[PDB]
Amino acid sequence: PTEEQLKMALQKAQQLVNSNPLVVFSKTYCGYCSRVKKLFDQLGARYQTIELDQESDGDAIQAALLQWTGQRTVPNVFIGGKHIGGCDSVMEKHRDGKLVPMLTECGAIA
Numbered sequence: 001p002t003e004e005q006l007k008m009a010l011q012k013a014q015q016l017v018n019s020n021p022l023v024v025f026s027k028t029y030c031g032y033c034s035r036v037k038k039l040f041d042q043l044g045a046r047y048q049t050i051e052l053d054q055e056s057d058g059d060a061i062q063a064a065l066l067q068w069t070g071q072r073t074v075p076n077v078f079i080g081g082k083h084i085g086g087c088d089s090v091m092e093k094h095r096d097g098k099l100v101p102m103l104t105e106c107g108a109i110a
């Protein structure tokens, strides 16, 4: 990715995060992505999925997410504009009772 491509990809990722209470940066056949989506489904939370493998600038987006979050893998979850992390991170928040209130606070759960 060129520096302009990384910049454009970051802007794209930020706009998605800004315009969705819950965002799941994903890949279509990632088992961990499927797990987190299933959890959110069952919690009644609406999310925007973005499948990097189906985006033309998916590599640039993954590079931008690394720069932005230090994370190299999908799923890469944001809630209310804030970085959550991967499947494990989301499961951790579900485990300590913080996830539903976070999801409610930002509108992801009505």
Ligand SMILES: N[C@@H](CCC(=O)N[C@@H](CS)C(=O)NCC(=O)O)C(=O)O
Residues within 6 Å of the ligand: 027, 029, 030, 031, 032, 072, 073, 074, 075, 085, 086, 087, 088, 089
């Ligand atoms: N501990 C991480 C593991 C996630 C993970 O390993 N994701 C794989 C996809 S199955 C990945 O992103 N591999 C590198 C890639 O596909 O870019 C989590 O719970 O989210």
